[PDB]
């Protein structure tokens, strides 16, 4: 049951990259949307998603092979897992072949001309060197006919993929998201110089969504003071604590240690997690 | 109600009848088409209001008697909806003999 909130962000993520495909075709000269090139260029990410799609098939096959029979009421979580995959706006099988074909084409190009900077460019720079300008044109042309032909073009463009918490501008509050002191004064800032409403860790970030299980944060979980913040990336998560009964399959007082207990002390970015002050 | 235009009468006979009587039936049919035109819009407005009520069913509800009142109200709403459907059916069937000449005129002019 607890995997369902994670899967919502999993589907919400693949739609953002597919949305950028349609936008980039009309205007290939827009430099502000060059992030789409690097994401597909990463070599392990294409394999990593394929592995995720592989285990998703294995899990669904195993669940179909070994369903829950003693209690039909408990089949909702298993059934919902099948439904969310089928009801996705873009078919996973069509998207699976999309990344597979990119890997093969990007391997033959290495044999055509030996180069090691392109591996760095596709992973870190998220750009294509000017000497390989012809390679960039291939991504625009081929992506249109491959997967979009089996999906709703109108729906994906207007789909609500906002709130992915990808950019830093939507992590910290807009009041403090700017340079506060000149470079001569240094980079570290004493707390006393912060604005009065911005002198606490509660006002530093957007405390709306969770970062580990990708679930919406209710008012009860905000006010209990049991949530944690990462001192490195500004992430906020209530991991490592017992979840409320309303988030369980059935409201009950039984305490279960959920998987968020892995990140009790270490954040996702190897940063330290601390109890958020109230 | 009243059948000003007899059934089964030809178009030319209706033209001859219409040419006289100082257009009392013309006034009646003009009033009928005017009220149909002025009725078309309020039906759309109240239908949109019903859609808005249905969409906002999960708001402004805290007591069970509130549900009694609201759903009795909506059942009454569709009650006058069916009543208005019957009234517009009567209006169109009243003008049905008048409209019956149009297919004959079109097929003769073909």
């Amino acid at each position: 049951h607890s995997l369902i909130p994670v899967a919502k962000w999993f589907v919400k993520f693949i739609t953002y990259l597919t949305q950028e495909i349609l936008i980039l075709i009309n205007d290939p000269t827009n430099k502000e949307y060059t992030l789409v090139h690097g994401i597909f260029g990463a070599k392990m990410s294409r394999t990593l998603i394929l592995s995720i799609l592989n285990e998703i098939k294995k899990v669904t096959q195993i669940v179909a092979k070994f369903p829950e029979t003693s209690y039909p009421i408990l089949n909702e979580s298993s059934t919902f897992l099948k439904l969310v995959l089928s009801e996705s706006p873009v078919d996973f099988e069509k998207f699976e072949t999309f990344l597979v074909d990119v890997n093969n084409k990007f391997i033959a190009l290495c044999e055509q001309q030996p180069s090691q900077e392109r591996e760095f460019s596709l992973l870190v720079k998220a750009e294509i060197p000017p000497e390989y300008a012809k390679v960039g044109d291939f991504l625009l042309q081929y992506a249109n006919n491959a997967v979009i032909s089996h999906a709703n073009a109108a729906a994906v463009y207007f789909a609500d993929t906002s709130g992915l918490k990808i950019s830093n501008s939507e992590f910290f509050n807009p009041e403090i998201f700017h340079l506060l002191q000149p470079l001569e004064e240094g980079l570290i800032i004493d707390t006393d110089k912060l604005p009065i409403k911005n002198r606490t860790s509660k006002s530093f970030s957007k405390l709306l969504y969770d970062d580990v299980t990708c679930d919406k944060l209710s008012v009860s979980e905000i006010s209990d003071g049991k949530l944690k913040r990462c001192s490195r990336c500004g992430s906020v998560t209530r991991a490592g604590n017992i979840i409320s009964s309303d988030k369980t399959i059935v409201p009950t007082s039984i305490q279960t240690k959920r998987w968020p207990t892995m990140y009790t002390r270490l954040c996702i970015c190897s940063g330290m997690l601390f109890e958020m002050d109230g | 109600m009243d059948s000003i235009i007899p059934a089964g009468v030809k178009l030319d006979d209706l033209q001859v009848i219409l040419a006289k009587n100082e257009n009392e039936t013309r006034d009646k049919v003009c009033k009928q088409i005017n009220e149909a035109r002025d009725e078309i819009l309020p039906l759309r407005l109240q239908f949109n209001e019903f859609i808005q009520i249905m969409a906002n069913i999960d708001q402004e509800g805290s007591k069970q008697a509130d549900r009694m009142a609201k759903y009795l109200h909506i059942r009454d709403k569709i009650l006058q909806l069916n009543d208005r459907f019957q009234t517009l059916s009567s209006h169109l069937e009243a003008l049905q003999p008048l409209f019956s000449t149009v297919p004959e005129y079109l097929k003769t002019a073909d």
Binding site: E87 | Q15, L18, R26, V29, I33, A36, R37, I40, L43, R44, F47, I51, L81, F85, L88, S89, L92, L98, F99, V102, Y105
Partner: protein
Amino acid sequence: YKNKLTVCFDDILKVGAEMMMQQQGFSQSQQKLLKEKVKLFHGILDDLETSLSQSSSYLETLTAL
């Protein structure tokens, strides 16, 4: 047109019949079915209004001629 207006309000309840059946989240197919039903209801209302206006104009022009 007489039957279309009757069935459309019967179908909007029929379209919802399966919507509250599961209720007795929401499926996207049922939501888009409701959307197309309401938009076609509006469209046929507009078409009937245009037909009434054209028939009326024919009425005055034939009465004048």
